[PDB]
């Protein structure tokens, strides 16, 4: 394949792929390039047959222009946006906590017509954040991703509902714009047509018709075939066009009687003006396609018109009338049916570019309002464009979007796959969309149009199910925002390698066959009938003559993550979802290793993630070091790549890169020259291959629990580096400026032994919870010590320190090595917040080993907590003495419908120990379908089994039966995949053979270090006197309602009382109970909880006389 550095991973695939997997990050980079109008996008648009393409920002500036003051005495026009070089490098932006942005410049032509003058000069429009290569935004040091938003597209949507009141099928239609007010029509059960403008009270359609100027004759002529409109006209009292305006106007202005001019112009302004109503260039297209109007030209108009509104009304009437095909004067014939709002032919995708463009438009609208207000009150013929253009609102809008918008999310740097799948995520929620607690089931259920566009397997398992998804592997975003997918064209029973990208609504006009349907060597279909999708989403058999399109490859419907799972067929969708989701939670291990049995995706997903380093130009490696790689290109140019070492990710996982090249080695352009965290030789490596035996073992693996060999702890098989950041800032107060110093009041000399002269913890020192990280003190002020303290301080005579200790200390339950310090000082002219003087950040790194309670998981949705780690000698071992690394329970496999893990286990053993099919008298029948490359392979040979073109069930048996002998010359595993294990504790062999193989297991990031809590006594909240928890040290557990029900059901009174009063809210009783425990005395009775007293006070404050009496 094109990738030069691919390790030789033999593949079981049998189908030739006609299309190469596209750039997985294109959905972000292409959209952003469109936004800024880069020359690459401009040239590509021309190559697509377009003429005079306009960038996203050029579109906004042209829409803003021309700014015209009323009476037309002057005008202003922005144009020609330009970008200069970025202010700082990405690495420097991250290090110094800046925003990666480039200056933006435009030209502004100001025209004075009353004198004919024209002026123009470059105007600085501010710093514009820039998408870095590999698709992320650096905002205030943090790394952020803008997730594309799936939203229902503007257009006309007809719907029909049957009502049991009369069993009639009532009809309604809604016209939804991208900007402006709404409009809808409906047919009532009384055989009448109604209109609702801006969701106001229902009114007859004839009112709207006569408002536009229609009369009896025109309505009779065009709509006379329908009884409902005739009845509505007969019932309506309106007579004359002005009469309709008389009725309409007072509804919005109850107190002002109408005037003809304003009333007549109100309708045009409300809907038929592009100033206040806009279809946004996509609603226009959809309306033209649906109603058949204005087809065949790129209509610049985006406002509502008279012809289209009446066309929509007529379409509704005909749909109620019962027509199946309709035609329009001056238009084209179209079918008649209701519209499904869940179809991707109706739902579009706001990419990052459009999301940024909307906020740019809002900011420029505010700027326009300010400019048009202030241009009336300045000297004419002496004003200058740069002296009245105010760029503050646009910069403020841009800052707000990247900071507070729900879409601009923190980059998910758990591992390369997590970041890769986060960039191409689709979100149905957020502003302008739906919400988590609404939309019911309909919005989130799967739909036949998702095939090849949105993955049905991968999705959050929590309450966001269906509301969040992943773009398909082959899918690309249409310029209008729709999702396109590629298909092969087939002519009269023979395929043809011309691939067309079809949108969702165009696919329904054809029948598409499966990718795996066999074909002759010439491309002709070999079968008489083929299984195909139909226009309604059904799957049916069809004669080979009738097919007109074909799937590109079997992997078309799955996402990047789902494509990683081998033997995806044998895992139920419920568990496939879990398997796809867990891979995003795997932590990077110290040394990653690629899986023995995997999928062809493992390579590309690693390279496209952007975490690895690839050679930009062909050349020879000149110098290699742990920190940088220098390469001499064949053209005479020299490149230097810096490798980030032990950098802390967003979630605390280490992100170390390492070189994989030797000095003097020649590298082709695009070749991988350094691995990322979870990669080996360019292939992704999220976990570890290890020996698994499937059998219950003394109940330690009971209920999904897992047993590990102690070897994994001795040899750092599952060890991972974790890095934490502790930050402390010194500010000023009314009593003076608090300072950072080594010496602090009343601390033992040993405690401050590892502190620098400036009070910071010495780099490389070992730190344990409670140790000093930064010595800090604050002015104390008035003390007025108690008499006992006065006497004590007289006894020793120690000074009453003018300052109080507020030093930063290691949190409870943390430890590690101090690997770095970053310090900001205002005396050096830093960008510290207002009122801040100093800032110190200390990085503490630790080396976590696998231990009890750590969650492990596989690629097939099987996970569990490590219940016991046994010594090596206690593990069952093969007859040759090799102990099994992990033991999994048998009862969990068959009932969870994830048998694919057993297939993976068998194929892993086949891969570890080479195989050689005995081709002595011809290939065996079961091996007749295998490629010649798979006949033999050495030990430790990696294999690839694509998700829908992998090894069959029959070939696995043969491969198991043809495994090579072990080191000593004997086979450890029989053809059935089982071995005679020996019991490590009693020594006796197990009575029956046990399934043994090699499985790829992942170390999930769900460490309970942030979920283990303990509290005897701690902080209490200011407002409610109950303990706080879940966001600070020593959090308290919530004793819920159902627990109170359980307490009452037990008949347990005293325990419940002490839980609700002493332990939680009785302010007086807490200290009494604490002193009783300390002194060894029995606990006193509880008091009245503060909640009840506050309730009485609150009721009394509301003029309610509430009292307790006996």
């Amino acid at each position: 394949n094109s990738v030069p550095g691919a390790p030789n991973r033999v593949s079981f695939a049998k189908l030739r792929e006609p299309l190469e997997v596209p750039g997985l990050l294109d959905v972000q980079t292409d959209s952003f390039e469109w936004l800024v109008g880069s020359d690459r996008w401009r040239q590509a648009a021309i190559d697509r047959g377009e003429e005079n393409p306009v960038g996203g920002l050029e579109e906004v500036l042209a829409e803003l222009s021309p700014i015209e003051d009323f009476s037309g005495s002057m005008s202003l026009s922005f144009s020609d946006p330009r970008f200069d070089e970025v202010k700082a490098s990405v690495d420097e932006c991250k290090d110094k906590d800046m925003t990666y942005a480039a200056p933006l410049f435009v030209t502004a032509e100001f025209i004075n017509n009353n004198t004919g003058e024209i002026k123009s000069q470059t105007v600085f429009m501010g710093d514009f954040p820039m998408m870095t290569e590999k698709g992320t935004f650096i905002i205030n040091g943090t790394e952020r991703v803008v997730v594309s938003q799936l939203v229902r597209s503007p257009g006309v949507y007809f719907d029909e509902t049957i009502d049991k009141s009369t069993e009639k099928t009532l009809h309604s239609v809604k016209v939804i714009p991208g900007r402006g007010a709404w409009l809808e029509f409906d047919v009532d059960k009384r055989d009448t047509v109604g209109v609702r403008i801006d969701r106001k009270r229902r009114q007859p359609v004839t009112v709207l018709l006569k408002a536009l100027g229609w009369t009896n004759e025109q309505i009779v002529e065009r709509f006379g075939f329908s009884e409902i409109m005739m009845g509505t006209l007969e019932k309506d009292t309106t007579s004359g066009t002005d009469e309709a305006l008389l009725d309409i106007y007072r509804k919005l202005r109850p107190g002002e009687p109408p005037t003809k001019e304003s009333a007549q112009t109100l309708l045009e302004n409300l809907f038929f003006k592009e100033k206040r109503y806009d279809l946004a260039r996509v609603g226009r297209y959809k309306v033209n396609k649906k109603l058949g109007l204005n087809a065949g030209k790129p209509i610049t108009s985006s406002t509502l018109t008279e012809e289209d509104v009446v066309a929509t009304i007529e379409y509704l009437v005909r749909l109620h009338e019962g027509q199946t095909s309709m035609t329009v004067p001056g238009g084209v014939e179209v079918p008649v049916e209701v519209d499904d709002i869940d179809h991707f032919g109706n739902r579009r995708l706001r990419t990052v570019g459009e999301l940024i463009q909307n906020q740019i438009r809002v900011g420029l609208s505010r700027m326009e309002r300010v400019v048009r207000e202030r241009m009336t009150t300045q000297d004419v013929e002496a004003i200058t464009p740069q002296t009245l253009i105010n760029i503050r609102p646009v910069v403020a809008a841009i800052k707000e979007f990247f900071g507070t918008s729900q879409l601009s999310q923190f980059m998910d740097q758990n591992n390369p796959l997590s970041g890769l799948t986060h960039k191409r995520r689709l979100s149905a929620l957020g502003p302008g969309g739906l919400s988590r607690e609404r939309a019911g089931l309909e919005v989130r259920d799967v739909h036949p149009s998702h095939y090849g566009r949105m993955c049905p397997i991968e999705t959050p398992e929590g309450p966001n199910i269906g509301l969040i998804g992943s773009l398909s592997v082959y899918a690309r975003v249409n310029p209008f925002g729709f999702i396109e997918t590629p298909y092969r064209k087939v002519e009269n029973g023979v395929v043809t390698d011309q691939i067309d990208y079809l949108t969702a609504d165009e696919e329904d006009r054809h029948v598409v066959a499966q990718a795996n349907s066999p074909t002759d060597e010439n491309g002709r279909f070999t079968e008489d009938r083929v299984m195909v999708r139909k226009k309604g989403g059904e799957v049916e058999f069809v004669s080979a003559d009738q097919v007109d399109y074909m799937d590109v490859s079997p992997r078309q419907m799955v996402s990047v993550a789902t494509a990683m799972i081998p033997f995806l067929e044998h895992d139920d969708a419920n568990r496939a979802l879990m398997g796809a989701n867990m891979q995003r939670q795997a932590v990077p291990l110290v040394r990653s290793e690629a899986p023995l049995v995997g999928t062809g995706m493992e390579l590309r997903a690693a390279i496209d993630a952007g975490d690895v380093v690839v050679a930009d130009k062909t050349g020879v490696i000149e110098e290699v070091s742990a920190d940088y790689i220098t390469v001499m290109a064949d053209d005479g140019t020299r490149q230097s790549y810096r490798l980030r070492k032990f950098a802390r990710s967003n979630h605390g996982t280490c992100a170390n890169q390492r070189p994989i090249v030797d000095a003097g080695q020649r590298v082709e352009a695009g070749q991988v020259i350094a691995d990322g965290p979870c990669t080996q030789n360019g292939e992704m490596a999220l976990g570890k291959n290890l020996l698994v035996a499937i059998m219950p073992w003394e109940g330690h693996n009971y209920e999904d629990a897992i047993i590990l060999s102690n070897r994994l702890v001795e040899e750092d098989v599952l060890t991972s580096i974790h890095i934490e950041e502790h930050e402390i800032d010194a500010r000023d107060t009314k009593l003076g400026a608090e300072e950072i110093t080594r010496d602090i009041p009343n601390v033992s000399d040993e405690v401050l032994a590892d502190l620098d002269e400036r009070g910071i913890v010495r780099i490389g020192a070992e730190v344990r919870d409670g140790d000093i990280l930064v010595g800090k003190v604050t002015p104390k002020g008035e003390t007025e010590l108690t008499p006992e303290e006065r006497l004590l301080r007289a006894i020793f005579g120690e000074k009453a320190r003018e300052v109080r200790d507020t030093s930063l200390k290691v949190p409870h339950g943390e430890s590690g090595k101090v690997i770095g310090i970053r310090v900001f000082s205002r005396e050096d002219d830093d960008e510290l917040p207002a009122g801040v003087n100093e800032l110190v950040r200390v990085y503490v790194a630790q080396k976590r080993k696998i231990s009890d309670g750590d969650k492990l998981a596989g690629r097939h949705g099987n996970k569990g907590v490590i219940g016991k780690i046994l010594p090596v000698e206690d593990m069952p071992f093969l007859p040759d003495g090799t102990p099994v690394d992990i033991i999994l329970n048998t009862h969990g496999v068959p009932r969870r419908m994830n048998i694919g893990q057993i297939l993976e286990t068998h194929l892993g053993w086949v891969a570890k120990a080479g195989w050689n099919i005995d081709v002595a008298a011809g290939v065996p029948d079961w091996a007749s379908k295998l490629p010649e490359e798979l006949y033999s392979a050495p030990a430790d040979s990696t294999v690839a089994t694509p998700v829908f073109d992998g090894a069959q069930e029959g070939e696995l048996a043969g491969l198991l039966g043809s495994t090579l002998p072990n080191r000593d010359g004997e086979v450890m595993v029989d053809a059935d995949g089982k071995s005679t294990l020996f019991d490590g504790r009693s020594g006796e062999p197990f009575p029956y053979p046990v399934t043994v193989g090699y499985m790829y297991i992942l170390k999930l990031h769900h460490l309970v270090d942030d979920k283990i809590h303990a509290r005897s006594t701690g902080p209490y909240s200011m407002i409610t006197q109950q303990p706080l928890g879940g966001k600070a040290q020593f959090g308290g557990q919530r004793f819920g309602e159902m627990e109170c029900w359980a307490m009452q059901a037990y008949g347990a009174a005293y325990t419940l009382q002490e839980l609700l009063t002493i332990k939680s809210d009785d302010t007086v009783g807490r200290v009494k109970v604490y002193e009783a425990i300390v002194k060894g005395e029995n606990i006193p009775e509880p008091g009245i909880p503060e909640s009840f007293k506050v309730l009485l006070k609150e009721l009394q404050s509301l003029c309610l006389n509430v009292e307790v009496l006996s």
Binding site: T786, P1019, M1022, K1031, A1032
Partner: protein
């Protein structure tokens, strides 16, 4: 996550009525005819007018 405090501070002292500050009560009457009492210390210097409840 963030912390604050009321406009005052707490005191841990314990003593009770075993210490007595010598006090006496003054009597006041208002315009509407209501009457009120105010305990003052024996240092007295009681004011002639007082803002009652």
């Amino acid at each position: 996550v963030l912390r604050g405090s009321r406009l005052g501070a707490v005191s841990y002292e314990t003593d009770r009525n075993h210490d007595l500050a010598p006090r006496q009560v003054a009597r006041y009457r208002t315009d509407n005819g209501e009457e009120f009492d105010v305990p003052f210390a024996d240092d007295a210097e009681i004011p002639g007018t007082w803002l009652c409840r």
